Amino acid sequence: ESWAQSRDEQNLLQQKRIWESPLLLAAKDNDVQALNKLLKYEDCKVHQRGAMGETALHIAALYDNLEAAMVLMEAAPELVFEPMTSELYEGQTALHIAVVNQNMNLVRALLARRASVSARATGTAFRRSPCNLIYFGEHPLSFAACVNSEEIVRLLIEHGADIRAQDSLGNTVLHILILQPNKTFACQMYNLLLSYDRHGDHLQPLDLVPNHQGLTPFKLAGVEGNTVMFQHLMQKRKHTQWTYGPLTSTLYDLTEIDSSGDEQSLLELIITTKKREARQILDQTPVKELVSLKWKRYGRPYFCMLGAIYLLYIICFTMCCIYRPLKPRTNNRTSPRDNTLLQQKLLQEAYMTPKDDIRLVGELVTVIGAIIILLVEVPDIFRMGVTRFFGQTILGGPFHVLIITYAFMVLVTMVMRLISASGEVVPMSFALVLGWCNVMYFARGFQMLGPFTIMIQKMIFGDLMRFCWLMAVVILGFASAFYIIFQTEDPEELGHFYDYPMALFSTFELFLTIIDGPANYNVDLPFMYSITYAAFAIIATLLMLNLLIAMMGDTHWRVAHERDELWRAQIVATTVMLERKLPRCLWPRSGICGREYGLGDRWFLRVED
């Protein structure tokens, strides 16, 4: 908004300063005879700074004027050593500009005049931002690699441009190629820049240098969803054992792919990222066979065993609420609308029979199981982001909130049982609902229920929320109308709208048609009731069929191919989680280690095809 307005004013201010400067105007439209006469007058301000700190050589490079750029260079060679000075294009020399324009006659002329090939374009328009259309890095090698200029990238390296140079983000030129929109040119420019890594004395290969986030180019291809660069980079990690007719046994390196646990791996990065195209990497041929085999061998048995424990635990909590201690009430009824018969016992009376001691066993099992949930969920999100990266795992998984909220409602029921507080049915009823609805976390391990259950998550976070905002507006209008229509009437015949919170709840139930329409037929109802309830019935039939259309076309050709891809992504997210919190004796590491096969200390996945 405001900064994009400020960029627009500086770009218009650039064009004004070109027109009102006879030096800069001459370089824009290649009037070399105008370049002569301003130098015939005096050896004047070639140190004219424009709006973005332009010099006239920067103007001649931007508008692709060869002959205009020459006259600046013989008259003042020092303008090749000058960068732009403004905050928007800081550090950019005319070497950067001639490379991006692919003006090769100009960039040969600049390298003849020792133009600095290590100049860092550190301006704001060169950062990797949502508000910059290019991210070319900041070195002229990085700018040449992104414009697909195989001649200039050779020309700069043969004049001393360093292929080891990083940016403020730490991205080397191999990282920057992965961030490029034309992914096929990036593969050709990958191999050429990797070919100049002849040096076996630079301590580390170029494809193994991490950026400041600690990602290598291989791992950065997985995070960005760059499936084209991912398949290309993986062929360096293949090793074909044999070829038997149509058969081919291929051996995969599985080093940065597999979750080793010391550093964040390629499986962990893809699960925790916001790119939709990173999920496409899970179907690639090292990663697909890797995570499907550790699911079938070890992930799925340790998930169904972990669901059978949660099922027996939630039956144990359920029985402790069915058999909760209750005694007949003491006082008399305050009013004839008082429905209550029983009340909960105090702590002294709650354990005075042998049936109360079998319950006390299950209540302690419930308390312990709720603490263990808080011992494994509450600390392990503090080492992550407390609310933000936790909340980014809520859009990935809502069952983080639901089982923490379950375990809190249980310990609230414990504290209310200790201090003998009235109203234990409130935290119990939240916990029975939350604790049972957490069983459909375990629907993802079953191939029948798994894809069905993600479609729940898409429609609660989507279309059912769109419906409920417009439902609550219609309810607030009609519950208020139904309240005042029956505000004069006797409530002993038709009590649906007797006060305003019940009128509001009756209209919600009439909207969903889960209670019948109010009718007596023995008494006269207001005529305004039938007019209003007819209009209410049409608007509800409109909305509840609008939802059924909206839930439809969003979920047949839009997310039906996505729900099965997100089910396979939940298998990976479940397996990465179960491998992380279980010890190595329970989880044998995937692949086959070397060192007894001559392959090293790396772990290999053999895929026969």
Ligand X SMILES: CC(C)CCC[C@@H](C)[C@H]1CC[C@H]2[C@@H]3CC=C4C[C@@H](OC(=O)CCC(=O)O)CC[C@]4(C)[C@H]3CC[C@]12C
Ligand Y SMILES: Clc1ccc(CO[C@@H](Cn2ccnc2)c2ccc(Cl)cc2Cl)cc1
Which structure tokens are listed for 608?
A: 């026969």
> Which residues inside 113-132 make contact with a copy of itself, applying CB under 8 A?
none
User: Which one of 326, 346, 376, 439 is in contact with ligand X (CB under 6 A)?
Assistant: 376
CB 371 within 8 A of CB 407: yes
> DSSP string of 15-34?
HHHHHT-HHHHHHHTT-HHH
For the CB of residue 442, give the shortest distance to ligand Y in the complex, in Å: 5
Question: Which one of the spans 226-234, 271-279, 366-374, 443-451 is the region binding a copy of itself (CB under 8 A)?
Answer: 443-451
User: Which one of 170, 391, 398, 462 is in contact with ligand X (CB under 6 A)?
Assistant: 398
Q: Is 433 in the site for a copy of itself (CB under 8 A)?
A: yes
User: Which one of 468, 519, 586, 593 is in contact with ligand X (CB under 6 A)?
Assistant: 468
Q: Is 501 in the site for ligand POV (CB under 6 A)?
A: yes
Q: Using CA atoms, how far apart are residues 195 and 184, in angstroms rounded to an integer?
A: 17
Burial class of 334 by CB neighbour count within 10 A (0 to 12, 13 to 18, 19+): exposed
Sequence length of the chain is 609
Q: Is 309 in the site for ligand Y (CB under 6 A)?
A: no
Q: Binding-site residue total for ligand POV (CB under 6 A)?
A: 15
> Which residues inside 31-60 make contact with ligand X, applying CB under 6 A?
none
Task: Give the per-residue contact string, 323-352, with ligand POV (x = CB under 6 A; - = no).
Answer: x-----------------------------
∠ Cα 344 347 351 (to 5°): 95
Q: Is 309 in the site for ligand X (CB under 6 A)?
A: yes
Q: Is 250 in the site for ligand X (CB under 6 A)?
A: no
User: Which one of 75, 169, 443, 577 is in contact with ligand Y (CB under 6 A)?
Assistant: 443
Q: Which is nearer to ligand POV, 421 or 468 (CB)?
A: 468
Residue 233: closest CA among 248, 255, 214: 255
Q: Binding-site residue total for ligand Y (CB under 6 A)?
A: 10
Q: Which residues contact 10 (CB under 8 A, 6 or more apart)?
A: 51, 52, 86, 88
444 makes contact, choosing from a copy of itself, ligand X, ligand Y, none, with CB < 5 to 8 Å by partner type, with ligand X
Three-state secondary-structure class, residue 450: helix
Q: Which is nearer to ligand Y, 442 or 529 (CB)?
A: 442
Residue 255: closest CA among 555, 609, 592: 592
Residue 225 region by backbone torsions, left for phi larger than 0, else alpha for psi between -120 and 50, else beta: left
Q: Which is nearer to ligand Y, 77 or 301 (CB)?
A: 301
Residue 506: closest CA among 528, 488, 481: 481
Question: Which one of the spans 190-198, 278-286, 391-399, 545-553 is the region binding a copy of itself (CB under 8 A)?
Answer: 545-553
Q: Using CA atoms, how far apart are residues 607 and 286, in angstroms rounded to an integer?
A: 8
Q: Using CA atoms, how far apart are residues 143 and 167, in angstroms rounded to an integer?
A: 12
∠ Cα 393 397 402 (to 5°): 110
Q: Binding-site residue total for a copy of itself (CB under 8 A)?
A: 150
Question: Which one of the spans 206-214, 276-284, 446-454, 567-575 is the region binding a copy of itself (CB under 8 A)?
Answer: 446-454
Q: Which is nearer to ligand X, 109 or 440 (CB)?
A: 440
CB 433 within 8 A of CB 411: no
Q: Which is nearer to ligand X, 213 or 532 (CB)?
A: 532
For the CB of residue 305, give the shortest distance to ligand POV in the complex, in Å: 14
CB 59 within 8 A of CB 44: no
Q: Using CA atoms, how far apart are residues 409 and 431, in angstroms rounded to an integer?
A: 6
516 is an annotated ligand-binding site residue: yes
481 makes contact, choosing from ligand POV, ligand X, ligand Y, none, with CB < 5 to 8 Å by partner type, with ligand X
User: Which one of 22, 306, 546, 565 is in contact with a copy of itself (CB under 8 A)?
Assistant: 546
Q: Which is nearer to a copy of itself, 41 or 527 (CB)?
A: 527
Which structure tokens are listed for 281?
A: 């990497």
559-574 b/e (C-beta count within 10 Å ≥ 16 → b): beebbebbbbbbbbbb
Q: Which is nearer to ligand X, 310 or 323 (CB)?
A: 310
Task: Give the per-residue contact string, 253-292, with ligand POV (x = CB under 6 A; - = no).
Answer: ----------------------------------------
Q: Using CA atoms, how far apart are residues 117 and 95, in angstroms rounded to an integer?
A: 8
13 makes contact, choosing from ligand POV, ligand Y, a copy of itself, none, with CB < 5 to 8 Å by partner type, with a copy of itself
Q: Is 318 in the site for ligand POV (CB under 6 A)?
A: yes
For the CB of residue 437, give the shortest distance to ligand Y in the complex, in Å: 8
> Which residues inside 487-516 make contact with ligand Y, applying CB under 6 A?
none
Which residues sit directly before a break in the chain (C to N > 2.5 Å)? none
Q: Is 460 in the site for ligand Y (CB under 6 A)?
A: no
Q: Which residues contact 124 (CB under 8 A, 6 or more apart)?
A: 87, 88, 90
User: Which one of 449, 476, 535, 552 is in contact with ligand Y (CB under 6 A)?
Assistant: 449
Chain CA centroid to CA 31, Å = 52
Q: Is 446 in the site for ligand Y (CB under 6 A)?
A: yes
Task: Give the per-residue contact string, 159-198, with ligand X (x = CB under 6 A; - = no).
Answer: ----------------------------------------
For the CB of residue 7, give the shortest distance to a copy of itself in the complex, in Å: 8
* 3-class SS letters over 102-150: CCHHHHHHHHCCCCCCCCCCCCHHHCCCCCCCCCCCCCHHHHHHHCCCH
- Cα-Cα end-to-end distance for the chain: 54
CB 430 within 8 A of CB 370: no
Q: Which residues are annotated as a binding site for Ca(2+)?
A: 516
Binding site for ligand Y (CB under 6 A): 439-440, 442-443, 446, 448-449, 469-470, 473
Q: Which residues are annotated as a binding site?
A: 516
Binding site for ligand X (CB under 6 A): 306, 309-310, 313, 365, 368-369, 372-373, 376, 397-400, 403, 429-430, 433-434, 437, 440-441, 444, 453-454, 456-457, 460, 468, 471-472, 475, 481, 501-502, 504-505, 508, 527, 530-532, 534-535, 538-539, 573
Binding site for ligand POV (CB under 6 A): 311, 315, 318-319, 322-323, 439, 468-469, 472-473, 476, 499-501
